[PDB]
Coordinates of C-alpha atoms in Angstrom, one line a residue:
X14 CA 1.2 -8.0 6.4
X15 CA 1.9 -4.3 7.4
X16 CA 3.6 -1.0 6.6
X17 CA 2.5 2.2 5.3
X18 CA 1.1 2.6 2.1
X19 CA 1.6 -0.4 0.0
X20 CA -0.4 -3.6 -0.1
X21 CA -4.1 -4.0 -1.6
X22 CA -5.9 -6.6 0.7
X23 CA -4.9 -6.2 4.1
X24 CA -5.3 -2.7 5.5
X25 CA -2.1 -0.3 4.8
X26 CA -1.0 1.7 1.9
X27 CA -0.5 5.1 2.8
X28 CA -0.9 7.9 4.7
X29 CA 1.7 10.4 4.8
X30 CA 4.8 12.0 4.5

Protein backbone atom coordinates (compact mmCIF):
# COMPACT_ATOMS: atom_id res chain seq x y z
CA UNK A 1 0.00 0.00 0.00
CA UNK A 2 3.06 2.46 -0.07
CA UNK A 3 6.84 2.86 -0.36
CA UNK A 4 9.10 3.97 -2.86
CA UNK A 5 9.53 2.21 -5.97
CA UNK A 6 7.98 -1.11 -5.84
CA UNK A 7 4.44 -2.07 -6.42
CA UNK A 8 2.49 -2.14 -9.92
CA UNK A 9 -1.13 -0.96 -9.08
CA UNK A 10 -1.23 1.49 -6.54
CA UNK A 11 1.00 4.46 -7.11
CA UNK A 12 4.83 4.04 -5.86
CA UNK A 13 7.76 2.39 -7.32
CA UNK A 14 10.48 4.70 -7.54
CA UNK A 15 11.96 7.68 -7.61
CA UNK A 16 15.36 8.14 -6.41
CA UNK A 17 18.41 7.51 -4.71
Amino acid sequence: IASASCTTXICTCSCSS
